[model samples]
Target: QWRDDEVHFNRTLDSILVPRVVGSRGHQQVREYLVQSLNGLGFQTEVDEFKQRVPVFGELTFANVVGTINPQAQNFLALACHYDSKYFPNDPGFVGATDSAVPCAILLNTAKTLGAYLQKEFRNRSDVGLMLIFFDGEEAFKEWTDADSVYGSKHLAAKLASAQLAPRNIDRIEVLVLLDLIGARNPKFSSFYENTDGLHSSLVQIEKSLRTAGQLEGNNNMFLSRVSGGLVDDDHRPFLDENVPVLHLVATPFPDVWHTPRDNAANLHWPSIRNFNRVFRNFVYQYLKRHTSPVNLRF
Candidate 1:
């Protein structure tokens, strides 16, 4: 109830960031938008730029637009979504509206809603750092089956590998949630990895929050479990490899209008966006409670 502005009908996804699929320009546009949004929300932000090497392409520029609401929190919870849109070489142009545009918008709105509250209350308490990373590239190259992609994530993971372990002597992290393709008409969230106990249980908590808030249809169907077999070269893999358990909120059967210019605002489900926000916000609020001064009350 306190965060009504964050739950508005945002249609900024209609913007044409790239007229003809310039990877560098697209990345710049998305990062600028995120930085502006976070700065407007009164959070100290930083644009982390990293140079990546891709085959054929000598240097693919990538920037992770990172916003930190509470820099001093002992326990950190990160909400991430890739902003890079994929495209082919010769003719086909890919406008990844559902693949990421929707999810990025969701994160933007939520960050604007919760950034201030988290900074004022949770930032100093345990240094609860809440970061939203707009990854540069996560889509596959050429054949949609190459390892050259995921450049942004691979670099970040490599960096984290050096600075391994929690920021401070804080307890275990609440879990990292990566939102990807969560805005299909009939939204269904499949748990990316199954056998990973720590990560799986983290998703369970999120599902419960969504269900309780009337955002989820049901745990079984809406948030079904998936076989952790396929090696999805998503942004989640990098964090997972860095010993960080992540819940990838992605949908399968990427809508029929996927990758084409057809994947626009008209194709998105407003209800799905709202419901996803409700569930994700509940999860964040609950996690915030664990670190901050407990609200001692009984019903």
Candidate 2:
């Protein structure tokens, strides 16, 4: 039942993240690697592929890698991360280490850990399932919005909607946590969100989890504000549409290395990655145990 193993930062960033720059062949290669890893851990994995024409960019192929555990369960929780990087030609082919690769690493590692743990712990009760979704095409041709990017996730969301899946099939998703650009130097985690009342409380639960774990207190600059004004193009929006209360774990202010050749793992902070992984694991563990009242639950 314990999921606190430290994912070695060097192995995570250097081996899996350093070479990945989403949308490019490198990104696809990493997806393949992830699928293999997930399969190795005993989950039924699938790559939902789609072809599309991006705004400024020409025809492109994308995929959303999905791995499911206890799929028969209706009450599920998803841990999602976008696995694509921007292809900023001016910046020597934007390597999206923190922009996404770190999240991928964390979730993959979490899946591996939880996969092993759940086998023994929840083998009897088949009501809860944990899914890992690695989304592609979240970045755009310098646009990063509905008109610009988030193609793979959008397609998946649409596919789910067409299929009438999500909330109708899922009894009640405790929450969906989307991690973006998490491995920055001196990183501060402030949740930005939309869909006010429904999603705001879920994020507050996440922040409280971080605070109890002693991670959020050290960063004075991190703001836990309501997402009243900003409507981001991140992957969370698609899930939010289905009324699935979500937690968008993203950091803005655009780091200097963002969309540049310098955005590689060298510019990333390992301790920050470790802390994020720990915080996320803690938050999920706490949230699942507490009752479903999002407003009343306090860490």
Candidate 3:
């Protein structure tokens, strides 16, 4: 199943991050690809488009893609990644695979596998929901600043915080898990939020169990028991600021290919993607099972 899962992962890496600037042809193409793929997988997909003025790029359109499993349900667990690649001067070939392409691919893979299961085995279990979000305009156009980056997430976070239009409000979202700078060989992640320390420890424990059972091969490290004791200002920041529990799954120092053209499919470690797929799927499974049960009540 891991090999079968990697097939999907490779396809995503092959999607290649063109200069996906807001409102560009490349952005539309990638957006269409995700909407079509998620729809084909039986998810109810919606697009949140908005125009924002960046420092150097001026006014541009950014769309956040949201796919819901069991759209009728209110409470849900959210997983997200930024779909847009960073802009580099005169560098049209930069793919940003590790920066976020792989993370988005992993979310897709998890959605495909778990979404199918939700419809089949968990049809009667409507106690919880799953939401897959692909954010746009996360990369700063010129320089990283509070107003320049995370355009899509900031917009969506505000929408969710307001809890308008849709039946379920922002409070319906129990927790959020944001992934970035993933899919590199021997990657290491730390507990970025003290609020989510318990959840981070649970994931680290899952990695140990998988390695012991031979489900996760190699000596590649996954999580650090002692975090670097720092906070990360990622897409989760907006949600966290709203008092939402967020598990930030991003490498501490970032990948070597980060922000470079070398962050392509060729440099990605196949094994890392496969293992992460398994771990993330299992973590979601455990979280859903635990949260959906009537005896337990914690986010």
Candidate 4:
């Protein structure tokens, strides 16, 4: 069952609306806020810090925030979104509301809203756990080149690949449901990979179930079964290379305000955010519960 929570939704979005480029002041603030919010919910929070040399910016540092419940768990289902906004010299006020701010809020809101049920019931469920990743420096400093773009994801993916030599942690990611460019009008989502298409369809069903139960409203239809928009370079790229299945949840044709100064608070649609909130919350809940259901029988 889903409920409308405009307060949490708005607060989370507002906190992330800062123009947080990788090295900006606002970037550090939002990172602290995410860590605070996640830790406040009793999840084990950690940060992945690294430095990369950009074509123009020289050596720049990046931090990718990680939050997880049931730390002893062997398998994980991750929800990810980049916390950094794009850099435009002329448009310094570009907040990228749809670009990724909305996605970040969605992840935080989901974790907070589901905190109690997760902690009380599933503390010892060592097979699977929920993970949240807030990636920094996802955007390129200058041009979107192969080496520049997806810096946060690229760095973390390489780290996971190295860890695979040991704990099976890298291979244990059942799926990384990456969200981006959400909270815009009439947004459409499509499946990209054959491996994760089934989970994509499961998202479709979740949306429909919410709509049927009168839990979601306004721009209710978002997920498309027929694959059309192919893969766009995003935070999911490096993870895919590591053979981790990814469910990319970015809009089909990006919003009109994309990359422009207009991608600010004035353009974000609350109804769209609300609808996404329900679908995503239910999806995460269902995924965790479904995975843990067969343990007793297997033993």
Candidate 5:
């Protein structure tokens, strides 16, 4: 299944590599795929649509795709990734695969796996909820100015800030875990937000346990033991601005292929991607296990 997952990841990367400059046909295609796949997996999907005017791109409509498991639950643990690729002048083939394609694939795999487990293992339990978010227009149409970047995130954050539109309530979001630039080899994730430091620490501990048990190999820690100085500007920023705890899992010292045409599936390290998938899958399962009813032990 993991190998098949890698194939799917590669396929998704290829499918979304067009001129996905926000609101373009390519962007819409990716959005449709996300919504369709999530709904097919039994998630209750919601599309948040809005229009924004960019100086160069004119007026364009963007949609933020959100999927929820246990939609009736009062609280949520969310996973997010941006689906838009950067606009490279004269180069429509520039696919920001590592910039986020792999991250989205990883999140999709996580949601599908976890959602299935929830249905089969905890069918009667309603103590936990999960959200999958595919943020659009994360890339700037021109420069990386505040106004040009993170359109979907900024919009969604503001919309959810009031608690009236959020599931249960915006305050019920216990954590938002954002993934980006996760397909490179020997990737290292450093802590960015103090509020999510403990969660990062737990991830590090899980890596260590996996390594000790021979489920993972290598001496280098995939997650740093302490927070690093390099902070990222990503989809999680708006949520952080709203006091929502966020764990930004983007690699520090951006990958070599960042913003380049080389940021494609060919540059991705399959092992690293698989490793992240395993660690994250276990972490989420452990988290839900702690909050689930006794029947959760059946797993």
Candidate 6:
């Protein structure tokens, strides 16, 4: 199934593989693509738009795309990835495949995979369901700073805290599983937060099981067992500060082409992308399996 759907995956990835710097034309298009894709897959989506003072450009409007399966469910098994790519004045062609486009595509593919079951089979179950978020302005316009980066997350966390939209709000999220810097060759993820260590371990176990079942292309596991205490400031920082249980799936030491103009789609490794896709898809499926009716397996 993964093999046959490779073309569809590529189409999605290619559609998003563009310069999505905040406030740019590509940025708005990608944001619309994310919302449209989720809504197309039977998930209810909301686009949160807010204006904030950024570094390079003083005041700019940013948006975070929020999508939910079974919006009535009180408990949400959340997945997130930033949809914005970093900006470079010199490089208008920065596509950011590994930096973010690939991770965004993973979440999009997950929505495509599980939206059917979550819509009808698990609708209104209330125990747990899917909530996928696409954060905006995750990348710094000039340099990474507390005031510059993670604009969307910082705004959303505060807004959700103030509103208390109980039926489907921030309080309903069980954990925010954030993905970034994925789809490169031979990714190695370190344990970032002890709060979500078990969730990270579940990723390790999922990869191991897929490999054992001869479903993965690579031999080595991507998730590390040991805690390195190597924490990178990312979109999770705001949520982590808010006492949210965050499972960060970022590659440690960063991807080789990170932040450079070399971070384009040409550098992505297809085998690694395919393997990570299956592993992440299984992780989401396994999480939803406990609270909802089982969907027919194409694994």
Candidates' TM-scores?
0.79, 0.80, 0.91, 0.94, 0.90, 0.92
What are the RMSDs of all candidates, in order? Answer: 5.4, 4.3, 2.7, 3.1, 4.4, 4.5
Which of the two, 4 or 6, has more lDDT? 4
Query: Largest lDDT belongs to which candidate?
Result: 4
- What is residue 36's positional error in candidate 3, in angstroms? 0.8
Which portions of model 3 miss their true places by more than 4 Å? 1-4, 163-168, 293-299
Candidate 6, 141-179: lDDT as tens digits: 888878778999898888765634443266666788899
What does candidate 4's lDDT look like per residue over 73-135, in tens digits? 878888999999897878766788988999999998887677666778867678888889998
Which parts of model 1 have CA positions greater than 4 angstroms off? 2-23, 90-93, 144-146, 163-174, 194-221, 225-231, 292-299
**Model 2: colliding residue pairs:** 22-84, 22-85
lDDT of each: 0.62, 0.65, 0.78, 0.83, 0.77, 0.81
Instruction: Put down candidate 5 lDDT per residue, 121-238, tens digits, no spaces.
Output: 6445666787888898888878887888999999999888754454425566788889988888889898877767778887998888877877764566688887788657888888
Worst 10 residues of 5 by lDDT: 290-299
Tens digit of lDDT per residue, candidate 2, span 1-299? 34455544355455566444444667777778878877876777988898888755677788899887777765667789888777665654566887887888888766554555545555455557767888888877765656677787788777765534445542245566787777786555444544334444544566566657676535533335545345456787877776666677677655577766777867877665655665566555554444233222111
Clashing pairs in 5: none
**Which one wins by lDDT: 2 or 3?**
3
Better structure of 5 and 6 per lDDT: 6
lDDT of 3: 0.78
Model 4 is weakest, by summed lDDT over 10 consecutive residues, at 290-299
Which 10-residue window in model 2 sums to the lowest lDDT?
290-299
Question: Can you tell me which runs of candidate 4 are displaced by over 4 Å?
Answer: 163-167, 293-299
Worst lDDT window (10 residues) for model 3?
Answer: 290-299
